[PDB]
Design a protein around this nucleic acid. Structure first.
Ligand SMILES: [Zn+2]
Ligand SMILES: [Zn+2]
Ligand SMILES: [Zn+2]
Ligand SMILES: [Zn+2]
Length: 114
DNA sequence: CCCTGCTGGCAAC
DNA sequence: TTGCCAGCAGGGG
């Protein structure tokens, strides 16, 4: 069980820190500020990612192991991987011929050959 | 406290 | 269309 129950929604947590942090989703409080562009964020880790992706140079990026797409955030590569390079049991037919593929990247690359 | 990964709106192709 | 992005919560220290 988790005793700390949010007074506004159905969220509940085991400790007060996370309930306080969740309450920022209701109050709209943004405690953290980028010292460069003065944008504000709900969490400190979000601000750190903002400064890395917007105000830092020479930042290494993540190449997809199955195509040449380069993606800035590792989690966004996950979304790419789950969308483009994941098995589709029901398959997808080319919109120009009867060829069927089981990953979206294969479908899109084949369709381009027409 | 911080690190990590997921989420859906939204520019930008 | 999909990567960019801040919002967001779980988990470990
Ligand atoms: Zn709530
Ligand atoms: Zn900034
Ligand atoms: Zn790929
Ligand atoms: Zn075809």
């Amino acid at each position: 069980g988790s005793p700390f129950q949010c007074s506004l929604c159905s969220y509940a947590s085991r400790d007060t820190y996370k309930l306080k942090r969740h309450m920022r989703t209701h109050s709209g409080e943004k405690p953290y500020e980028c010292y460069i562009c003065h944008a504000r964020f709900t969490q400190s880790g979000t601000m750190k990612m903002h400064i890395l992706q917007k105000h830092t140079e020479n930042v290494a990026k993540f190449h997809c192991p199955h195509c040449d797409t380069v993606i800035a955030r590792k989690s966004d590569l996950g979304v790419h991987l789950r969308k483009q390079h994941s098995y589709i049991e029901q398959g997808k037919k080319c919109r120009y011929c009867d060829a069927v593929f089981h990953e979206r990247y294969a479908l899109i690359q084949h369709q381009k050959s027409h």
